[PDB]
Design goal:
heterotetramer; A alpha+beta (248); B alpha+beta (718); C alpha+beta (716); D little secondary structure (25); A: 248 residues; alpha+beta; two-stranded antiparallel ribbon; D: 25 residues; hydrolase (chain C); INFV_PA (chain C); metal ion binding (chain C)
Chain lengths: 248, 718, 716, 25
RNA sequence: AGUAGAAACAAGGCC
RNA sequence: GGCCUGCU
């Protein structure tokens, strides 16, 4: 309901109405990326030179009311000065650590689910067993492999369509799924997300990461199974080698 | 004893210890001023490798132009830009014969791409020169300004959203009797006549190149306007499609695939040869590559590629070389003066070089101005007979691959033959023969053919040695590629995005170098320790136990004291480092999940926190409060372009509201050609309708929302 | 014919039809009949939708005009003429809420009481064929289909016309009137015979006007128009043009191979001129240290307090006087600057608390030494035009300078093993896998063999100096700070120490570009008398400040102590790449690891232990009068680390150019030494390119000297 | 492991020029 | 003076 | 003196 109230308030003014009316839906990407600040040519130099200043971080306006002006000692955590081309206000890393040590708590019980690939990776590593290390020449041939341990056998476009249907049912558009496997996986995902409180964008990104298959050109010699290629840096060397059995 | 590191090569073969001879630990040379001293030199040299060409005078831009194609054959080894059209077409025809159906399939794929691409694709680019402010603006800003001017001046076919429609608008613009723009200085309307706008659309902006390794003299790099961007995009798409189908083209692939291709070629050539045949690998390099690829040859190639294709596709592909053949190279910032006696300095714009007296300059810049003056027109110099920098690397690589193919022993008609791998500006050619004079003849034939096609081999940076040892764009090969670790050294430091991003990026870089560049276990561990040390010293996030005194130490110590399981804090919050050679592929926050306190765990990854930026080398990242974004320089405020910030604020407000209405706008770019207000109102009406039909919305709320939408529509229609 | 479409229909219908045509990409100027057809279809669907409002139950009032109510409850929800995106969004939303089957193609309207779609079309061809095409197009059709031809013929599926017959009559009258107007105009036959090609869309990109006039001027010289050139290329067929032009071309254009032999290479031609001088930002070989045992690590402690405590250990201070003037400066200014720094240290010491940073007073001495008000005032060219001496900024080749003997000695001292521990790295994750244990052993070896090198002392000095300068110049951009140099190490017995080389006084540091200069007068202690290598201390202003009493193998010796004052400058990029100086360790250690692994591959067992302890197989490093002297793997590691550190310290364009152009020749020589029969097209050009880089940089000259020595020893 | 450079000359120099003793310690 | 090397910094814009 | 900028 409040969406239309905000739209009315926004269009009430002249410039906002003009931008709202003239611009079409297609130009939304251009308008979103419209910015005067150019990209950093040397990010490292700018970062090293920026942390020396006070307030090298920008945070939403809510910092004004969510974090005090100064901590116990009296070091400013945020400044009312606004950013260059946004309403975001300027804060110092003291603000980030103050949030970490005093900020509002929350139940992160759903975090392992959203980032299920990384925690599955840790699970495999924790239960893995090592063996003796062998010094012997390795014939490091270069070939294409799969880096995604649990790729769901879908193309990038097909995976994007599945994500959009699962997380954005109305925005799917003209596309209609064809393969029965796609329908089965879609139902499997939909059943387990019948009630999830995290934002739709995060769910979509997670499904995209854990469904799309990735391939990279690597100098592998022995293995090529996605579980083994994950730890390629630990079981393959110029002269040494090791036996590794991922947990599974 | 006088220690002498270079004496180590008496025992270690040069390839193995080649990392020693890469001084990639010190600051790279940086241009200290104006790139207008190198741009004039580039223009003069480009006109000096083609002076025998046929002069003329463009009848639309009204500037002199040079046409070296089909010029007199070169008589000395010096660089020559006199490409022969017949020879270029022979190379392309033989390339097609050796690879049947390459051009047809490439044209089909590119036809699909061009019919499908959207205007938004021009935003994914680097700095571009926007013709409405005569400055360098990000790609998105330049595109937005261009579209605004087009809509204002009557051009509106780009509203369809496809890129080809915007190209139609661009072409129809050049015929417009008189464009007008409304740039600020309260704003003024500046009207550009046909010729002025045409010269401004073809102009190229030139800035000096910074952070260049392996050269003593600075170069100049140019960035094209916004009208020529789309055509270049389509031509590059076609060239990439063609190169991906060529076994001898290394450009469109990554480093490891280059290694694979080069190893395959060497195995095919050296091994298949019998005992009696010799082999010789030329690790050459072409000189003045850009100053000789005449765009007219690119037009000839584009016309030969697109034979038997729809006329519209042929035209939209050919428009790019036609625009590049008439390009004007904007000089640059312009020189700067001083007065030792009077103790003052002045800056002269590059525009007034055509009118300024020559009593101020040196004995070299005076000659450069005297020689470049005839080409200047309204502060820009005609640069027809060459390229400025790349922008066609794929097509140039296609030409190189064609010339390499032209010696398959089917076109050589002689015992000697050659092949190899071509990457734009760099080649490795592998000759075979039954006797040494055969190799000599093969090398002469290759050199002469390349000279005919308009590409010159550099004779001061090429050597020929028995096959085996050789080099190729810094991938040294000694009976198997040897990994030089000094090229990837600059990547190890903290990248500088933010805390979590930096940790992920550093650990990922260490892992990748362990995989590819053969970084040993002990060296990987020392790199990890040094990276953690640098990261702590840059983010002030020391371990907490230490008595370090910094602007951030007080509450890092406080948090350390507060926590129970001190072995779970993120390295960004003063926790211990838990990585090793076996954990490099696991993101940090996912690594310490078991060791984290419930309170700290909840506070850390809290969606409500105001620092996460909702996301933005593939570094594996996890959303966390340490994903904040750095500020911007805020240097615009002093200038006269203050009003742009209000435009940014309003655009962000509108796009955030739209995001609120359409959930998928953030994920997938929103398509459609209905104005934003109409889309928002239609979505609101349908949402209310469906909710009332079966949902929570009742009659009162339905009536209120419908009347609000009605008044919104009324306000729109005004 | 645009008048007909613009007049016979309502303004809104024509407007939305224009929007649709623009969406699909067509141009109304050419495909006018398609525009009229779209407008007619839209009007048909709108008349179908309008005048229908459902209520509480399944019935409608079907008012005639202007009869709204609070219970709107629209009977129809138009789908046509909404844009593809919005149309599909609404279709998916209604299908989801109802749960029906989404039609494959876009319908026209929707039925809420019955919950099904409706498709309406306008046809000029035979009605039955169009209707059956519609029916078969709609797979498993659950949606009603309706067809309205101009002549009046009507059809549908099951004849379930769920609409008021008055609406049907109204639409029939509208179509009949439109037919009358078309017949009066005379485009009706064209519309009837033009429906076949309306569905297909052909791209009509073209070149005309200025673009064509530019294209006609962008062809090979002998062609006149683009069309003629395309006709020529299309008819092109290969007929031996390349082989025909090769013979025609001159025979002077060749690529003669000149064999490279043991006698071909010659020593590089080092420049000639006055000997070069020191250019690093801090003394390397002549660096005294006033130390004091202190149980602190890395950054613990306030640098000013540490510096003053170190200063309060040496009691031999005398009255400073100059012993090697600057030859270009105002040396009394340097003497007064040192006096002021010492007085300021006394001042801060007398104070209760030690400030984190101290800002020096803006006196004339610091003002001159730090170059304040030196920059000429910026002015526009309009008035500064007739100035007699107005010129271009002096941009000339750097002054040539020759190679001195001091750089070799500095590189020698920068490879020896000290008796301290200059680098103390933090802990790493506990090792589990056997690779981790082997790596830990090898890393212990490396960090022992590299922590004691003096090149690591230089690394730490540079890192600290650059970090301090960057942080101070980013905060106090308008005051002269005072940044003492500090470095901490563990003695041979493990006792911690803190060191004080000298002091830095940052100047005004308003840095904007990443090449600007912040001048900092650098004051350093030392024990070496400048009157031994005067050509090396060209830019310093050595003073004699004290007289130490050190203990040696003989006991008290009492040498004098000196202060090497100088001005200097560093940019925002040099400071960054000096802060990032710790990658030298990575470079050298990666090389050593590669060598050790390469050897250990042949012998199926780890070789690091005997490499570092047994003093096993050695590499040729260095050059003594007796010949080339071998060195153990430890010395190779230290030498490579020192080379990397000096590359970082003496970085410059000359080094980059020489490194590349000499790697080329080194590879050629290596190919010769492998009996690969090398060959060069133009060796003289390569030598000239190499010799162009050696101008005045001491490090580049030293590297060229090493290369000459290597060429002498190699190939022989 | 304690590094030991054959050219050590641990007794050759009477005093380290850079890191002396001066102080009574 | 100093950094630096084919041109710049050694503060700049406005009221 | 005051404001504003430290890649514009």
């Amino acid at each position: 309901m409040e969406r239309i109230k905000e739209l009315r308030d926004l269009m009430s003014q002249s410039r906002t109405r003009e931008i709202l009316t003239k611009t079409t839906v297609d130009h939304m990407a251009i308008i979103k990326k419209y910015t005067s600040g150019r990209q950093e040519k040397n990010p490292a130099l700018r970062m090293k030179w920026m942390m020396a200043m006070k307030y090298p971080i920008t945070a939403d306006k809510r910092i004004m009311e969510m974090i005090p002006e100064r901590n116990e000692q009296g070091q400013t955590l945020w400044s009312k000065t606004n950013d260059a081309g946004s309403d975001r206000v300027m804060v110092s890393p003291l603000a980030v650590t103050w949030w970490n040590r005093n900020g509002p708590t929350t139940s992160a019980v759903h975090y392992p689910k959203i980032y299920k690939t990384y925690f599955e990776k840790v699970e495999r590593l924790k239960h893995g067993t090592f063996g003796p290390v062998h010094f012997r020449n390795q014939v490091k041939i270069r070939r294409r492999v799969d880096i995604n341990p649990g790729h769901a056998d879908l193309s990038a476009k097909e995976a994007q369509d599945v994500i959009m249907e699962v997380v954005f049912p109305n925005e799917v558009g003209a596309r209609i799924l064809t393969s029965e496997s796609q329908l089965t996986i879609t139902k499997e995902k939909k059943e387990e997300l019948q009630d999830c409180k995290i934002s739709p964008l995060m769910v979509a990104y997670m499904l995209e990461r854990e469904l799309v298959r990735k391939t990279r050109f690597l100098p592998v010699a022995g293995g090529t199974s996605s579980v083994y290629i994950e730890v390629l840096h630990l079981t393959q060397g110029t002269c040494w080698e090791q036996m590794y059995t991922p947990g599974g | 004893m006088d220690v002498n590191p270079t004496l180590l090569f008496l025992k270690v073969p040069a390839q193995n210890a080649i990392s020693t001879t890469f001084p990639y630990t010190g600051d790279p040379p940086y241009s200290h001023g104006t790139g207008t001293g190198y741009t004039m030199d580039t223009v003069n040299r480009t006109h000096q490798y083609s002076e025998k060409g046929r002069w003329t005078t463009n009848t639309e831009t009204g500037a002199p132009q040079l046409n070296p194609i089909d010029g007199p054959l070169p008589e000395d080894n010096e660089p020559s830009g006199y490409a022969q059209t017949d020879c270029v077409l022979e190379a392309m025809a033989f390339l097609e014969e050796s690879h049947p159906g390459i051009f047809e399939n490439s044209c089909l794929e590119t036809m699909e791409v061009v019919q499908q691409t959207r205007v938004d694709k021009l935003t994914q680019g680097r700095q571009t020169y926007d013709w409405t402010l005569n400055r360098n603006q990000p790609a998105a800003t330049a595109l937005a300004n261009t579209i605004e001017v087009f809509r204002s001046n009557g051009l509106t076919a780009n509203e369809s959203g496809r890129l080809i429609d915007f190209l139609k608008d661009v072409m129809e613009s050049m015929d417009k009797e008189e464009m007008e723009i409304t740039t600020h200085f309260g704003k003024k309307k500046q009207r550009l006549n046909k010729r002025s706008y045409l010269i401004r659309a073809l102009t190229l902006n030139t800035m000096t190149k910074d952070a260049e390794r392996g050269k003593l003299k600075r170069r100049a790099i140019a960035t094209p306007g916004m009208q020529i961007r789309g055509f270049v995009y389509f031509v590059e798409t076609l060239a990439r499609s063609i190169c991906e189908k060529l076994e001898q083209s290394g450009l469109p692939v990554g480093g490891n695939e280059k290694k694979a291709k080069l190893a395959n070629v060497v195995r095919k050539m050296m091994t298949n040869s019998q005992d009696t045949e010799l082999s010789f690998t030329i690790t050459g390099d072409n000189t003045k590559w850009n100053e000789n690829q005449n765009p007219r040859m690119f037009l000839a190639m584009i016309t030969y590629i697109t034979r038997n294709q729809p006329e519209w596709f042929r035209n939209v592909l050919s428009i790019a070389p036609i625009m590049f053949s008439n390009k004007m190279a904007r000089l640059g910032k312009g020189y700067m003066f001083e007065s030792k006696s009077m103790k003052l300095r002045t800056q002269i714009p590059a525009e007034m070089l055509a009118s300024i007296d020559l009593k101020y300059f040196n004995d070299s810049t005076r000659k450069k101005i005297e020689k470049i003056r005839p080409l200047l027109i309204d502060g820009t110099a005609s640069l027809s007979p060459g390229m400025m920098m790349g922008m066609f690397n794929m097509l140039s690589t296609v030409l190189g691959v064609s010339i390499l193919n032209l010696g398959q022993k089917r076109y050589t008609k002689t015992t000697y033959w050659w092949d190899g791998l071509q990457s734009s500006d760099d080649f490795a050619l592998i000759v075979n023969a039954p006797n040494h004079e055969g190799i000599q003849a093969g090398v002469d034939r290759f050199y002469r053919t390349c000279k005919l096609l308009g590409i010159n081999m550099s004779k001061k940076k090429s050597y020929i040695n028995r096959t085996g040892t050789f080099e190729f764009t810094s991938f040294f090969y000694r009976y198997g590629f040897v990994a030089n670790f000094s090229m990837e050294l600059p990547s190890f430091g903290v990248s500088g995005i933010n805390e979590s991003a930096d940790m992920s990026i550093g650990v990922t870089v260490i892992k990748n170098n362990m995989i590819n560049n053969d970084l040993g276990p002990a060296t990987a561990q020392m790199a990890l320790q040094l990276f953690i040390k640098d990261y702590r010293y840059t983010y002030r996030c020391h371990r907490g136990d230490t008595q370090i005194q910094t602007r951030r130490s007080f509450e890092i110590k406080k948090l350390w004291e507060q926590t129970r399981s001190k072995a779970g804090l993120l390295v960004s919050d003063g926790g211990p480092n838990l990585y090793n050679i076996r954990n490099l592929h696991i993101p940090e926050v996912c690594l310490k999940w078991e060791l984290m306190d419930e309170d700290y765990q909840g506070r850390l990854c809290n969606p409500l926190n105001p620092f996460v930026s909702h996301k933005e080398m593939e570094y594996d990242a996890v959303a966390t409060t340490h994903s904040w974004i750095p500020k911007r320089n805020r240097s615009i405020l002093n200038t006269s372009q203050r009003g742009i910030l209000e435009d940014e604020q309003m655009y962000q407000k509108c796009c955030n509201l739209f995001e609120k209405f359409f959930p998928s706008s953030s994920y997938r770019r929103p398509v459609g050609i209905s104005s934003m207000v109409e889309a928002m109102v239609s979505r609101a009406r349908i949402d209310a309708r469906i909710d009332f039909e079966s949902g929570r919305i009742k009659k009162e709320e339905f009536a209120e929302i419908m009347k609000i939408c009605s008044t919104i529509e009324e306000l729109r229609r005004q | 014919m645009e008048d007909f479409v613009r007049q016979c229909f309502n303004p809104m219908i024509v407007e939305l039809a224009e929007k649709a045509m623009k969406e699909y990409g067509e141009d109304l100027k050419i495909e006018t009949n398609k525009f009229a057809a779209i407008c007619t279809h839209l009007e048909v669907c709108f008349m179908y939708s309008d005048f229908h409002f459902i209520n509480e139950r399944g019935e409608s009032i079907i008012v005639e005009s202007g009869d709204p109510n609070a219970l709107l409850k629209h009977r129809f929800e138009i789908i046509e003429g909404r844009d593809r995106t919005m149309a599909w969004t609404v279709v998916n939303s209604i299908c989801n809420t109802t749960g029906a089957e989404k039609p494959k193609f876009l319908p026209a309207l929707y039925d809420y009481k019955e919950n099904r779609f409706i498709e309406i079309g306008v046809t000029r061809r035979e009605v039955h064929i169009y209707y059956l095409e519609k029916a078969n197009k709609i797979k498993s059709e659950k949606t009603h289909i309706h067809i309205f031809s101009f002549t009046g013929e009507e059809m549908a599926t099951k004849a379930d016309y769920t609409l008021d017959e008055e609406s049907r009559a109204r639409i029939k009258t509208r179509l009949f009137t439109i037919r009358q107007e078309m017949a009066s105009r005379g485009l009706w036959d064209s519309f009837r015979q033009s429906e076949r090609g309306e569905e297909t869309i052909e791209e009509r990109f073209e070149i005309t006007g200025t673009m064509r006039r530019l294209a006609d001027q962008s062809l090979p010289p002998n062609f006149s128009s683009l069309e003629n050139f395309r006709a020529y290329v299309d008819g092109f067929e290969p007929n031996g043009y390349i082989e025909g032009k090769l013979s025609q071309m001159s025979k002077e254009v060749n690529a003669r191979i000149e064999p490279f032999l043991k006698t071909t290479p010659r020593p590089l031609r080092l420049p000639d001129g006055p000997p070069c001088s020191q250019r690093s930002k801090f003394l390397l070989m002549d660096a005294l240290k006033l130390s004091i045992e202190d149980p602190s690590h890395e950054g613990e402690g306030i640098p000013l307090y540490d510096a003053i405590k170190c200063m309060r250990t040496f009691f031999g201070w005398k009255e400073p006087n100059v012993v090697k003037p600057h030859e270009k400066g105002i040396n009394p200014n340097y003497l007064l600057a040192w006096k002021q720094v010492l007085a300021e240290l006394q001042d801060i010491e007398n104070e209760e608390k030690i400030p984190k940073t101290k800002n020096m007073k803006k006196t004339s001495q610091l003002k001159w030494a730090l170059g304040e008000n030196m920059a000429p005032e910026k002015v526009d060219f309009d008035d500064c035009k007739d100035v007699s001496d107005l010129k271009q900024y002096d941009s000339d080749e750097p002054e040539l300078r020759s190679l001195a003997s001091w750089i070799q000695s500095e590189f020698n001292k920068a490879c020896e093993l000290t008796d301290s521990s200059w680098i103390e790295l933090d802990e790493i994750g506990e090792d589990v896998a056997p690779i981790e244990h082997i790596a830990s052993m090898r890393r212990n070896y490396f960090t022992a063999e590299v922590s004691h090198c003096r090149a690591t002392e230089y690394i730490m000095k540079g890192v600290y100096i650059n970090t301090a300068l960057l942080n101070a110049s980013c905060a106090a951009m308008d005051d002269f700070q005072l940044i003492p140099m500090i470095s901490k190490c563990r003695t041979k017995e493990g006792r911690r120490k803190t060191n004080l080389y000298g002091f830095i006084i940052k100047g005004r540091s308003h840095l904007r570009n990443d090449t600007d200069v912040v001048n900092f007068v650098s004051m350093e202690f030392s024990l070496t008398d400048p009157r031994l290598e005067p050509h090396k201390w060209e830019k310093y202003c050595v003073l004699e400040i004290g007289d130490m009493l050190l203990r040696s193998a003989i006991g008290q010796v009492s040498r004098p102590m000196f202060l090497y004052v100088r001005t200097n400058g560093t940019s925002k990029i040099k400071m960054k790449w000096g802060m990032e100086m710790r990658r030298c360790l990575l470079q050298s250690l990666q090389q050593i690891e590669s060598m050790i692994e390469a050897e250990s591959s042949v012998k199926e067992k780890d070789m690091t232990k005997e490499f570092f302890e047994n003093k096993s197989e050695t590499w040729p490093i260095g050059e003594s009068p007796k010949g080339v002297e071998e060195g153990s793997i430890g010395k190779v590691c230290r030498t490579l680390l020192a080379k990397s550190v000096f590359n970082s310290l003496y970085a410059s364009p000359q080094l980059e150019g020489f490194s590349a152009e000499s790697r080329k020749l080194l590879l050629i020589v290596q190919a010769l030494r492998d009996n690969l029969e090398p060959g060069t097209f133009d060796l003289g050009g390569l030598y000239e390119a190499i010799e162009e880089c050696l101008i005045n940089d001491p490090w580049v000259l030293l590297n060229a000297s090493w290369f000459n020595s290597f060429l002498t020893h190699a190939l022989r | 492991y304690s590094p030991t450079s054959p050219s050590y000359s641990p007794t050759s120099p009477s005093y380290s020029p850079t890191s002396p003793s001066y102080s009574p310690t």
